[PDB]
Ligand binder design. Structure first.
Ligand code: HEC
Ligand code: HEC
Ligand SMILES: [Zn+2]
Ligand SMILES: [Zn+2]
Lengths: 136, 136
């Protein structure tokens, strides 16, 4: 019941992006420029199907520097990971929730079996616990 | 001697992003959240390899809205497209330059054969007229 490191996620489908600036309620620790990625499996859910076991969503969080009215991507802060397994991740609505510090497999961030992550993602039960909307 | 609309570019490898805000010298018309994408042939070039004919880079430019210490993606403004053909686009350094308003295939923007585009990109001769760098 550990979430696997999503090897190769940077080659996945880019779902969407958002900037969370200082002062945002989620600034600790979501502050930065973030990009949402989906594997083949997760695309099926985003398109309006059921999320199949093996679907993985990644949220890739970068620091940024405001440089003359450009926001410029700096170092990666972390990745958040949601891993669909209806049986193994049953306690958290069938998604496994993990963080990797600087996107490194060695730096697991989740210490409460993902109940905190699940606490907020539960509001989205009707879209299978997923906030991001697939956009053209 | 026309740049092909890059059908399916939303499914390609996401290279990088940047935000250009009010007050940036490039605000008009490059203002917004932009995402750079690369087809397989473009990735060869970006990796430090050479760009094969048929390499395509896309810059996808979104309007954004302020939303309580968040910049949220709004409407697509346009896409910019560079298509590799050393022979057919030799007047603009082996890349064909085109813009599509709102990313629509029917709203081609470039009127000067891409000389305007090439004029700025020519700064980057030493990285084959590409600004963007592959990051992890
Ligand atoms: C609310 C107080 C949140 C808590 C706690 C967590 N997440 Fe979340 N998450 C939240 C929002 C509003 C979004 C959407 C961002 C966007 O650009 O629209 C997200 C997104 C994710 C994603 C991308 C998939 C999706 O649901 O859109 C992942 C992979 C994700 N979050 C993981 C994650 C983990 C591992 C958490 C605990 C450490 C976690 N989130 C907490 C809101 C909230
Ligand atoms: C300088 C005044 C520019 C002019 C005029 C044009 N472009 Fe450009 N382009 C510019 C920069 C600084 C960047 C990098 C942005 C980043 O996030 O790093 C770009 C990028 C592109 C891309 C992505 C590929 C790359 O070189 O990084 C494409 C596909 C692209 N630009 C196309 C484009 C076209 C079609 C133009 C004429 C309409 C054009 N550019 C003008 C700077 C400048
Ligand atoms: Zn405020
Ligand atoms: Zn500014």
């Amino acid at each position: 019941t550990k979430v696997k490191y999503p090897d190769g996620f940077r080659s996945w489908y880019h779902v969407k992006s958002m900037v969370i600036q200082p002062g945002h309620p989620l600034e600790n620790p979501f502050g930065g420029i973030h990009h949402v990625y989906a594997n083949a499996e997760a695309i099926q859910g985003l398109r309006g199907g059921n999320y199949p076991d093996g679907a993985v969503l990644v949220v890739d969080l970068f620091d940024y520097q405001e440089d003359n009215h450009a926001l410029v991507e700096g170092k990666r802060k972390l990745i958040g990971v949601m891993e669909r397994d209806a049986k193994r991740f049953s306690a958290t609505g069938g998604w496994g929730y993990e963080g990797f510090g600087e996107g490194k497999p060695d730096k697991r961030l989740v210490t409460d079996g993902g109940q905190g992550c699940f606490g907020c993602h539960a509001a989205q039960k009707e879209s299978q616990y997923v906030f991001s909307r697939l956009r053209d």
